[PDB]
C-alpha cells in the first residue's frame, strides 16, 4: 500500500537478528519491508527539495547586437581604434583588410580595421550550486493493515492517519523515528550526504525549465557568461562566443550574432535530469537515499484481536501485482469491531495448510461499522492455489494461478539485482545487507572496481560504451593470454552497464 | 558556441529517465548512416587505407570501422 | 675641402669615359671625386630629415596604480566580481584563496578573490612610422679650387659661394643638379628609397630622446600600449605587463606595479641608432645613399687662366691628412686677378719634373686683391719629394717625406673595402663602379649570398657571431669533407662581420 | 582554531613519551600539535620583525647629469684637460677624435678630447644589513577548547583571553613560555638564529618597497654605489654604469645618462621576497623557525568536568577543512556550567563505536550561561560516519561523508612531506622529530646531500632545473654503469625541487 | 648598467611566493619563442650544425636544442 | 616587462656607432663570469654531464662550453 501498484517495488526481509536492515531507497522505485512478527511497512522516497541554492555563472544563449561602428587605418599608420573599444559592453575585433588608393588611402597594403558591436544579452540561462547540506528527502511510509484500495495513491491527510507518516531527512538531522500509533515506531537511520553526488552537480535554469547539470559540463559551455555575483548590467565574459566577425574581400568587416542557443543546448543536455522548482527550493524527482531501518520498536498491531466471525465479500476481484503478489480487497459484513482477518493460501480444501506466505502481516478489520472495505496482499506459491478468506462455511475462496517458477524468480531477481547494481554501483551491495563479511567484503572489492571504472572509462556515452564494448568483446575472443579475463570482465561491465537502461 | 559539450559523457545515472534518452539510442547512429549515404564513395577510400594498414584481416576490419566513425564526426 | 680632415674620406676616380661614376654616400664617410680634366669635388651626406612620421603603438614604461579595491567570494557560492571590472581602466586578476569560518564564510575550501587596480600611465614611449617616400638626404658639395682653410667646415653662406652647394634628395625627385658657377653642374642620380631600409624601422621617442628602432623589435616589447590612433584617455592594451598580483597565502592578494621601465629599455636597445628632431622632422646621423655622379656638364673652371707671377708664401706648414695626401695652404702676393697656381710635386728639383698627382685639379687664385689665401691638396709618392708651388726663383720648395709604402697603401685600401663591405654588404660593390660585367656579377653573387646570410644567421649579436664563428672554426679545422669550404666560408664571413666594428 | 581554515595546516602527533616534539614553524604554514593527554594547540608564526638595520652599499638607479663641459686639443699639441677632471663628483671620459685644419687646428691627425659631466643621483636604493640578533618572531598560539567560530582570526584580546597567546622569540631570549591559563603553559625552545640564513640576506629599499635580497646578488649589481648611511652627496663609486659617452664622427662627445633603472632591477629581483616595513622595523612576511615544544607543564583543562546533560544545537553546519577534518560548532542549551562535551564519530547507532579520532582533545563547555556556543574539530574515517554530539535522547547527530582513502591520504602526506623537504631541506627532517637513529641519521645524510646540491647545482632558476633535469633524464635512460642513480636521483632531486613550487 | 644579475640564481626557497613568481615560468620560454619566430632561418642553421657536430642522432637533437638556447640569449 | 627583447639582434649596421656599442663587447662576458664566480661548483656539474655526453674528446669540450653558457643565461 503506496507501493503495491508500483512496477519497481522491492521486498526486504531477513534482518540482523531481527534488529535492523540496511536499505537503499531509490527515488522512482519502492521498498516493501517485512519482518517475522512486525507489520509490513511500505517505504518510498518521494521528493528531494534542494533548498536555497546560490547562483554560479549564468551563460547567455540568445544574444543581440546594438548600435555598431567601425574604424580603419591606412597601412603602416598604426592599428585602428574606436573610442567605444574602451567600453566593456561592446564586443570588438581587429583585422587587416585591403587598403589602397581607391579607399582614400595613399599606400597599397593591408590596412588595419577594428569593429565594435554592443553586446546586449536578451535571454540567459543560470546555474545554481547545490550544497549537500541543504538536501531535504521526504520519505513516505504506509503500513499494511486497516487500509483499502483508496489509500494507495491517496495522501490527503496523514498526520492523523496513524497508518501513514512522512519523515524529512536533512543532513543535520538525517535519522527520524516515525510515529506509527499502535504499529510502534519505524526507526529510519538515513545517509543523506551520499545521495546523488550533489557536490558535483548544479541546477540549471532556462526559460523556467530546470536541470541537474553536472559540475564539469557546466564549466565547459562556450557561451558568454557573467558571474553569479553580478546584479546590475552584467559584464559578460567571453562575448566572442556568440558574435561572428566575417570580413569581405574589401574594407568590410561584417559582424553578425549567432542565433538562440536555447535548443542548441537542449540537445547538449543529453544526459542531464530534469527538475522542477516550487520557489527557491529545487524539487527533484530522482536520486536515492541510503536508509537503515531500525525495527526494534515497530510492533504488530492487533495480535490480541479475535478472529472475524462471518460474511466477508470480495470487492475488486484479485489481481497480480507485477511480481507474483496478489492484491485482495475484501468487504467484511459484520459489526464485530476491531477483529482479525483469517486469510491464507491453500492448495487443497481437505487440510487448509497455509502453503504460501502473506505480505500484509496481521490483516485486521478495524472499523466497527457494518461493511468495511479492507485490502490484503499475499505471496502465493507457483501454481494453482486458493485464497481462503474467512472461517467456517461462509469463507470465501478464489482460484489463483501464479504463473512462474522458482528458477524464473531467481533469474528475475538476478536481473533485478543487476539493474540495481548498474545504477547504484557500490551502494547496491547494501540494499538488503544486514552487515557481514560478504556484504561488506564484496562491496569493498566493488568499490575498488567502481573507482577504477569511473576514472578509467568513466566518460563513455551510451553508444561509445557499446562501441568499445564490442572492441573488448573481440579482444576477449582473440589474443589468448592471462589478460583475457581483463578483456571480458570489461565486457559485461561495459555492454551491460549500457543495456540495462 | 560551436563546441557545446555533450552531457552524455557525464549522464547522471539515476533510476529515472534523463532529459534525452529516447533520442540517444539513434543519435550517433543516424549521423553515421546519414553521412555515409551522402558520399558513399568514402568506403572505397576507407577500405583502401584500412587494407593498407595493419594487415591482419581482423585488424583491417577495425581500421575500416574506426575510419568510418572518425570521418562523419570529425573530432 | 669639407672632406679634407675626415678620417673616413674616400677617393673616387676612373669613369665611364668621363660621363659618370657611381658612388655610395655613407653618412659618416666622405667622398672625393676627381676626373681627367674636371674639378675635384668633395661630396658628403650630412643629414636625413624624415618628415611626416605618423605614430604607431605607444608603450608605457612608468605606470601608476590609482584607487584599488578587491572582492572575495565564498567556496561554491559563485565567483567574485567587482563592479569596476567592467571598467577598462582597471587591471584585474582572479585567483583562489583559502576561505573558511575564520574568513566569515560557512564552508571551508578555496574561495575566489578578484583584485582590481586602476591603471594610470604617467610616462610613455612613442614609436612613429617612417615612410621611405618622405626622406630628405642633404648632399653637401665643395669643389677644390679658390678656397682656403676657413671654408672646410664653414657652411655660413653657400647659395652665393659658387664652390659649395647643398643637394636635397627626396624620392619624389631623386636625380638633382647642383649649379656651380664656372665649374658647370655636378649631376647626381641618387637612389633614396634603397638607403637604410626605412620601411622596416620606426622612430622611438622617450623623455625627449629618439632612436631608430627596428620594426620587428618594436612589436615585441612587453609593455602596456595604446594604439597611437588613440587621442583621448588611452586604453592601454596589455595592462598586466607592469602590474604584479601576488596572493600571500590567505584571503589577501596584493597588487604592485613594476617600476619605471625607462632604464630597462635603454639597456634593451643597444643596437638601435638614436636620432634628433628639429620639429616634426627626425634628423638622422646615419644611413647611406646610392648616388650616380653624372659629370658630363661639370667643366673645369679657368683653363684659360694665365699663370701666377711670383711670391707664394705659406700660411701653414703642410700636413699629411691621415691618408697620405698633403694639404697646403698658400698665400699669393700680387694682383694678377683670376690666375692659376703653378704647383706640383718635384722629385729631382733641378729637372723640376712632376712625380705625383695633384688632388686639387686646377688650383686657381680668384680674387684680384694683393693677398688672397688659397688652399691646395697634393698626393705625394712614397718617398722623399718636394712641393714646388711657384715659378722661377721665388718658387717655394718644401721637402716632403711620405711615411708609407705601396703595399702599405694596398693593405690600407683592402681593410677599407672590407670595412665598407661589412657595413653595406651588397651596396659596397658599387662604390666606384662604372658598370661592369664583373662588378655587377660580383655584386649579384654577393646579393644572393647576402640574402642567404641576413636570413640564415641574420639576427645574431656581436658576441654570438664570435661564438658560432668559433664553432665553425672547429668545423673548419675538422670534419674533412667537401663542405670544409662551407664551414670556413662562414668563418671569415661571421668573425670579420663580428669584429670590424 | 586560528589554524582551522588554513590550507597549509600540519598535524604534529606522537611525542617522546609526552615530553616534547620538535616542530618547524614555517611562516605561511600552520601547525596543529596534539598529544594523548594534552590539549590540542594550534601554533603559528605570524611575523618576523628585523629591528634597527644599519646599511651596506646603497646603489643609484636614477641619475642626473648636471652642468657638463668639454675640452679638446690639437694633434701632438698636448692632451685635453678640464679643471673639474680631478673632481670625484664628476664623471669623465677621454677620447681621440678627428682634428684637422677645419677645426681651427693646424696639424692633421687624431685629436684628444675630454668631456666631464657632473654625476648627481636623484633616486637611490638602499640595502640594509640584517643582523641575526635583531629578529623578533611572534608565535601566536590558540588551544582547542572553549572557543567558537569567531575566535579564529579574532585577535582583539589575547592577553586576557586565557586560550590564546603570543610567544615573541628574540635570539636574546631564544626560549619562551606562554601561560595558557587552565591548560598549563606551552613551553617553546626555538632556534631563532638557525632560521632563514640572515647572514646571507639584506633588506633592499627602492621607492617605498622592500625586499629580502640575497647577499651575493646584492654585491654584483652594476650600479653607482657608495658605502653606508651617507645621506648628503656621497662619493658614488662605479658611475659609468649610468652615464654613456658616445662620440660622433667629429669633435662631438655626447654624454647621456641611462634612465631610471628601477624597472630593470624589479625584473632582476626575480626571486627575492617582498617584505614590508612599519617604521624602523622590517616586518618580514616569510621564513621559518625551528621550535621544540616543551609540554610537560601543559595539562588538559576539564578532565575533571562532568559530561553535558541536555539540548545541544548545531549552529553553522559542519564542513571539511581542506584536509579531511570536520569543524563542528554546537550551541549548548543549558546552564550546567563548566561541563564536558560528549562527542564522537559513530558508524552504527546501536553500538556507537568510536571509529574516528578527535582533533580537539577534551571539548568543553565553559560558560554557565543559557546558550554557550562552542566549536570542535573531528577526524572521521573515510566513508560514512555520523557526528554524534550529546548523550541520551536529545542528542543531535549529523551525517558526514569524508571522501578519500587511506592509501590516498598516505600519498597526500608524501607529497606534503616532499614539498616540505623542497622548502626546508635539512630542517624538514625535524618537523615531527622526537630524535633517534633515524630522524637524526637521515638528517645527517641529507645535510651532506644538501651541501652537495646547494654547492653543486645550487644556483639554477626554475627553467634551467627542468632543462638540466631533462638532460639527466636522458642520461638516466642510457649509460649503463653504476653512475645511473647519480643521474636519476639528480633527476627527481632537480625537477621536483622546482616543480613542487 | 646592462649586466644586472638575475636574482633567480638565488631565489629564496621559502613557503610564500617570491617577487615575480608568476612571470618566472614563461620568461625564458617567451624569450626563445619570440626570437625564433623573428629569426626562423637559424633553426635550419642550428640544425645544419647540430647534424654535423654530433655523432649519434640522439646527440644531434641535444645540440639542436642547445644551439637554439644559447643564440636567443647570446650566452 | 620581465622579457624586453634585445634590439642587439636587429642591430642597425652602419658607420655611426649605435646606442650602446661600447657597453656591448663585455656585456655577455660579465654575466657568465659573474655567475661562475658566484656558482663555481657548477663547473664540476657541467663537466660531469659533458663527459657522459661527449663521444669524441673534443665533443665533450663543446658540451662543457654550451652547458656553461646556457646556465648563466637560463635560456
Curated annotation (Swiss-Prot), chains B, E, F:
Cytoplasmic side: 55-59
Membrane topology (UniProt): Multi-pass membrane protein
Residue stretches spanning the membrane: 35-54, 60-75
Subcellular compartments: Virion membrane; Host endoplasmic reticulum membrane
Record remark: domains: The transmembrane domain contains an endoplasmic reticulum retention signal.
Record function comment: May play a role in virus budding. Exerts cytotoxic effects by activating a mitochondrial apoptotic pathway through M ectodomain. May display a viroporin activity.
The protein's name: Small envelope protein M
Range of the intact protein held here: 216 to 290 of 3423
Amino acid at each position: 500500500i503506496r507501493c503495491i501498484g508500483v512496477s519497481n517495488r522491492d521486498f526486504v526481509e531477513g534482518m540482523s537478528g531481527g534488529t535492523w536492515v540496511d536499505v537503499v531507497l531509490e527515488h522512482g522505485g519502492c521498498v516493501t519491508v517485512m519482518a517475522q512478527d512486525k507489520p509490513t511497512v511500505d517505504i518510498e522516497l518521494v521528493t528531494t527539495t534542494v533548498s536555497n541554492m546560490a547562483e554560479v555563472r549564468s551563460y547567455c544563449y540568445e544574444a543581440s547586437i546594438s548600435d555598431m561602428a567601425s574604424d580603419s587605418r591606412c597601412p603602416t599608420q598604426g592599428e585602428a581604434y574606436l573610442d567605444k573599444q574602451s567600453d566593456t559592453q561592446y564586443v570588438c575585433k581587429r583585422t587587416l583588410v585591403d587598403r589602397g588608393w581607391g579607399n582614400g588611402c595613399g599606400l597599397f597594403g593591408k590596412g588595419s580595421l577594428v569593429t565594435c558591436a554592443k553586446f546586449a544579452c536578451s535571454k540567459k540561462m543560470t546555474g545554481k550550486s547545490i550544497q549537500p547540506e541543504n538536501l531535504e528527502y521526504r520519505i513516505m511510509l504506509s503500513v499494511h493493515g486497516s487500509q483499502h484500495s483508496g489509500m494507495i495513491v491517496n495522501d490527503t491527510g496523514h498526520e492523523t492517519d496513524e497508518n501513514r507518516a512522512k519523515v524529512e531527512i536533512t543532513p543535520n538531522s538525517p535519522r527520524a523515528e516515525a510515529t506509527l500509533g499502535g504499529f510502534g515506531s519505524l526507526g529510519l537511520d538515513c545517509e543523506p550526504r551520499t545521495g546523488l553526488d550533489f557536490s558535483d552537480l548544479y541546477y540549471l535554469t532556462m526559460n523556467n525549465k530546470h536541470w541537474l547539470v553536472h559540475k564539469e559540463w557546466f564549466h565547459d559551455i562556450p557561451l558568454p557568461w557573467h558571474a553569479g555575483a553580478d546584479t546590475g548590467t552584467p559584464h559578460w565574459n567571453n562575448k566572442e562566443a556568440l558574435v561572428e566577425f566575417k570580413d569581405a574581400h574589401a574594407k568590410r568587416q561584417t559582424v553578425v550574432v549567432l542565433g538562440s542557443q536555447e535548443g542548441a543546448v537542449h540537445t547538449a543536455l543529453a544526459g542531464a535530469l530534469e527538475a522542477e522548482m516550487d520557489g527557491a527550493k529545487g524539487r527533484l524527482s530522482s536520486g536515492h537515499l541510503k536508509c537503515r531501518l531500525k525495527m526494534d520498536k515497530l510492533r504488530l498491531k492487533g495480535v490480541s484481536y479475535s478472529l472475524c466471525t462471518a460474511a466477508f465479500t470480495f470487492t475488486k476481484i484479485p489481481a497480480e501485482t507485477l511480481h507474483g503478489t496478489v492484491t485482495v480487497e475484501v468487504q467484511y459484513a459484520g459489526t464485530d469491531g476491531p477483529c482479525k482477518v483469517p486469510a491464507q493460501m491453500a492448495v487443497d480444501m481437505q487440510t487448509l495448510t497455509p502453503v504460501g506466505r502473506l505480505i500484509t502481516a496481521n490483516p485486521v478489520i478495524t472499523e466497527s461499522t457494518e461493511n468495511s472495505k479492507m485490502m490484503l496482499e499475499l505471496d502465493p506459491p507457483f501454481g494453482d492455489s486458493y485464497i481462503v478468506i474467512g472461517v467456517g462455511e461462509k469463507k470465501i475462496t478464489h482460484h489463483w494461478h501464479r504463473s512462474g517458477s522458482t528458477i524464473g524468480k531467481a533469474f528475475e531477481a538476478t536481473v533485478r539485482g543487476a539493474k540495481r547494481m548498474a545504477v547504484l554501483g557500490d551502494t547496491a551491495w547494501d540494499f538488503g545487507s544486514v552487515g557481514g563479511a560478504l556484504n561488506s567484503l564484496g562491496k569493498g572489492i566493488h568499490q575498488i572496481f567502481g573507482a577504477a571504472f569511473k576514472s578509467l572509462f568513466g566518460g563513455m556515452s551510451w553508444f561509445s560504451q557499446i562501441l568499445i564494448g564490442t572492441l573488448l568483446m573481440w579482444l576477449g575472443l582473440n589474443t589468448k593470454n592471462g589478460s583475457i579475463s581483463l578483456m571480458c570482465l570489461a565486457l559485461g561491465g561495459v555492454l551491460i552497464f549500457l543495456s540495462t537502461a | 558556441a560551436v563546441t557545446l559539450p555533450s552531457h552524455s559523457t557525464r549522464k547522471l545515472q539515476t533510476r529515472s529517465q534523463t532529459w534525452l534518452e529516447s533520442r540517444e539510442y539513434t543519435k550517433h547512429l543516424i549521423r553515421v548512416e546519414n553521412w555515409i549515404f551522402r558520399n558513399p564513395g568514402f568506403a572505397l577510400a576507407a577500405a583502401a587505407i584500412a587494407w593498407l594498414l595493419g594487415s591482419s584481416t581482423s585488424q583491417k576490419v577495425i581500421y575500416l570501422v574506426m575510419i568510418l566513425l572518425i570521418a562523419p564526426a570529425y573530432s
